[PDB]
Symmetry: D3
Subunit: 148 residues, 6 copies
């Protein structure tokens, strides 16, 4: 099925939010097919935020995501891309709804904990960039109580 890329950013890792976030997605029925902790490299970051390189606040994003460990993961299931964003909330955590990750835990735009792919095309780009193919599960077996 479909796949999305998720990164819990350095402020999320530092605040001890990793297991909480993973648990939310496992409980929803999405299946974990990639997971690692790493300190992102400058040129991985610059590729990651590539669509923003002609703007002034490009360097801020890059600087921040390389300042500490990130946990990177990909999950698989039906409509996982749009669903995962709904679960995260909206860009401003102050305006995100109670029950969403940023709604529950976040307070500042620059420290908004986690992000996910914004479309299926982005996700395929992002997944291939952060993860070598031997790091990803080929055979997925989900609960038969989940799909009809």
């Amino acid at each position: 099925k479909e796949r999305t890329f998720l990164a819990v950013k350095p402020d999320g890792v530092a605040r001890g939010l990793v297991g909480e976030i993973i648990a939310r997605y496992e409980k929803k029925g999405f299946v974990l097919v990639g997971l690692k902790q790493l300190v992102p490299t400058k040129d991985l970051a610059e590729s990651h935020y590539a669509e923003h390189k002609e703007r002034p606040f490009f360097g801020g994003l890059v600087s921040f995501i390389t300042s500490g460990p990130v946990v990177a993961m990909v999950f698989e299931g039906k409509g996982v891309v749009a669903s995962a964003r709904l679960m995260i909330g909206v860009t401003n955590p102050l305006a995100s709804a109670p029950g969403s990750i940023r709604g529950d835990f976040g307070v500042d735009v620059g420290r908004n904990i986690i992000x996910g792919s914004d479309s299926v095309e982005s996700a395929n780009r992002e997944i291939a960039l952060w993860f070598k193919p031997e790091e990803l599960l080929t055979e997925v077996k989900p609960n038969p109580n989940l799909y009809e």
Copy 2:
């Protein structure tokens, strides 16, 4: 006060979601006046989904709800019918909001965990169908800290 009928369907029971769901309603202040586990009978199912019998996907619904145990319950309180639906979410779990039962736990329309009565008239029909009157509490005593 008002009453609604709720059924946690076989996929919810199989996935170990029963106590979680009951706990959500107890925490809200609704009072439990009926509860049993049972494997629904063909002709109970056909009555339950009666308003759909002239459609092609009637047999699917019936087939599924009889394939395993269901836990059936009725709860009592002010506006319990509309409230319980709000707590469950909307038909597609992918589109249900974080914080709602289907929003948190569900992924497929056919495996959407639980359902409740969609009106007060439905509820009275459904309650009398699943539950003999001696199975239901007559005298309800709720928290005085709940109503004014």
Copy 3:
């Protein structure tokens, strides 16, 4: 496999602890094979607490368990009888350990929330007493990730 009888007593039901308790057992991997809410009858109570009828405080026990709704259930799995007691705690809730049901929620011996069968022989007696055989599941299917 093995089976135990559990009753959440009227103080547990009144305090909204039902779903919490059920959820603890589901999370452990035990499977729910019986469940109902009922107001126990005098002569069911007198049979239930039969081994105590020659003591003075017999009537207290009986009086109390009939004063409100009880939720009765049976669960099935390996060593479920001894395990369930370990999860409940010890007779005095004040002395029960944090993490146990009475340790977390209880404060008085007479209001100790829940109880379970104290042996396999008790359990078979108790189960047959509270539950007609058509109320109990015959075919149990647990997670294959639980047993080897």
Copy 4:
């Protein structure tokens, strides 16, 4: 930064909801700068609900908030006033969304658990009314992982 006044009303205190509510705000990243339990005085109540004194249901509000203990607190952070209201929900708990405090726990307008300041001007009035300045923290140190 900004500050709001919150009061968990006597129905919230009686129902054992205090720590749950505080925990929600701590998890969001707001910082606790005031906290006490007290039984409000008639003339403190009449000042508190001052903007309603020319209406008939003034006396109800006053009567109720003085009938038991209240826990009063102030929290500090970016957009804390509007954010806290979003977390509480809307006036009718039945219509508040799952994930919000009233959405999860409340059922009646008159027993709606908690309230917060509805603007920054209200908050400054309310804070100075319930709290002497030596009861409030002067120096606040929040997580650097929260703000940019």
Copy 5:
């Protein structure tokens, strides 16, 4: 009934553990009769840790408890003094059992989150020291579902 004094120390407050801890005691059925946040004064601290003044590490304790906000509370119920200690754990958090507060959250002896009175005589001394009598509830009404 009986009463104990509890203080969540500055490391507990800073780590956002306040509501979690309060919630544990509310869930057990103990009743909150005192609560405030304050920055302890040197001479309050020196009285508090009075039985240790002839030892070398007296000044450390005093220095630390005055370095930030503390939330002080007293709870009331049957055997609340011994019970509360059991819930906290033992002096070394590393050796405290899962389910206990220090067992779940703590790692260092000097940063062990919370403490409670070690006897009824200590509690009466400590309560009168931290709390003026008008700050304490006179009339306590607990759940009738708790005591027999």
Copy 6:
């Protein structure tokens, strides 16, 4: 500081327990310095369970740990090796105490969810075996509210 190796075995991953387990260790104050999901290779497994190769049930262990994904992690803090085992419980999940991971979630010896290093010497062997040195954090920054 000290480090231990932890593996959540294929039954834990399949049952959706990963985020729950990680969250327990983050809440305790231990810091995550390694994390990946992988399907273990035969000869990695045979090295991992090396001290058991002369026994008959060697092949079972190997067969099982290679049958699905494992999430491997290392955590760092004071007494992390002995502490982590205390948190997991004892070999038989039925006999593990409520509050421990196996006590809460497990039922069978062969399906006991997770394991950790049994000494500091084992941990150094195990860590170097599962993790290349560039996969591990060099610079650790924990909460200053944790250590004295």
